[PDB]
Amino acid sequence: LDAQSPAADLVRVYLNGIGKTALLNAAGEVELAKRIEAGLYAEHLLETRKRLGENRKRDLAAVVRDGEAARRHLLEANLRLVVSLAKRYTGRGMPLLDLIQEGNLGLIRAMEKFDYTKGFKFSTYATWWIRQAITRGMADQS
Amino acid sequence: GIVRIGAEVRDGDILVGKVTPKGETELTPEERLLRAIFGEKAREVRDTS
């Protein structure tokens, strides 16, 4: 066939891609981040006590895999928030895609260098970091 | 934030309370406006009463 078809909006593709997100209500995020911490500690100990041949030789690798999986979801957790904050700062000439991408970069730079430290909802911290990142993007765009 | 008049005080007791902000990255021209519009009271504070 050779019939033509209409194009698709880029934003709608983003919404379809993130529709699978399901926020954890800020409650379970602490254990979510305890999975990352233990994963990194597994990283270190895997290459520190190397000689040990044991059934545990696979459990820590599973903890590292759990840490890799725990981040893949934590990042999904905040895309609604980042898109909202980005949309809050539109109308300055930039396509919403460029701002939301910049906020995505800011988020990934944040949470991966964040600790609960008996801190408050990480959502406030993410909002702050992504807001700073998008503000910097707009400023450098001029 | 001050002790009521006529209240007995013992050694080691608190006499007046205050909060000391925490240190983070700052910019003189942008942080002022940013703090004015958004991000109010979102930084750590120490105790130096």
Q: Is B39 left (phi over 0), alpha (psi -120 to 50) or beta?
A: left
**Full DSSP string of B3-31:** PPTT----TT---B--EEEPP----HHHH
User: Looking at the complex, does the CB of residue A84 fall below 8 Å from at least one CB of chain B?
Assistant: no
Residue in A128, A130, A140 to test binding to B, most B beta-carbons within 10 Å: A128
- Asked if the Cβ–Cβ distance from B34 to A135 is below 8 Å, we say yes
> Resolution of the experimental model in angstroms, please?
4.4
Question: Is the CB of B39 less than 8 angstroms away from the CB of A135?
Answer: no
* B42:A135 CB<8 A: no
* Cβ contacts of A126 within 8 Å, gap of 6 or more: A78, A81, A82, A107, A110, A111
Tell me if A92 sits within 8 A of A139, measured CB to CB. Answer: no
Our CA-based measurement puts residue B17 at a distance from the nearest CA of chain A, in whole angstroms, of 23
Which of B 9-38 lie inside 8 A of A, CB atoms? 30, 34, 38
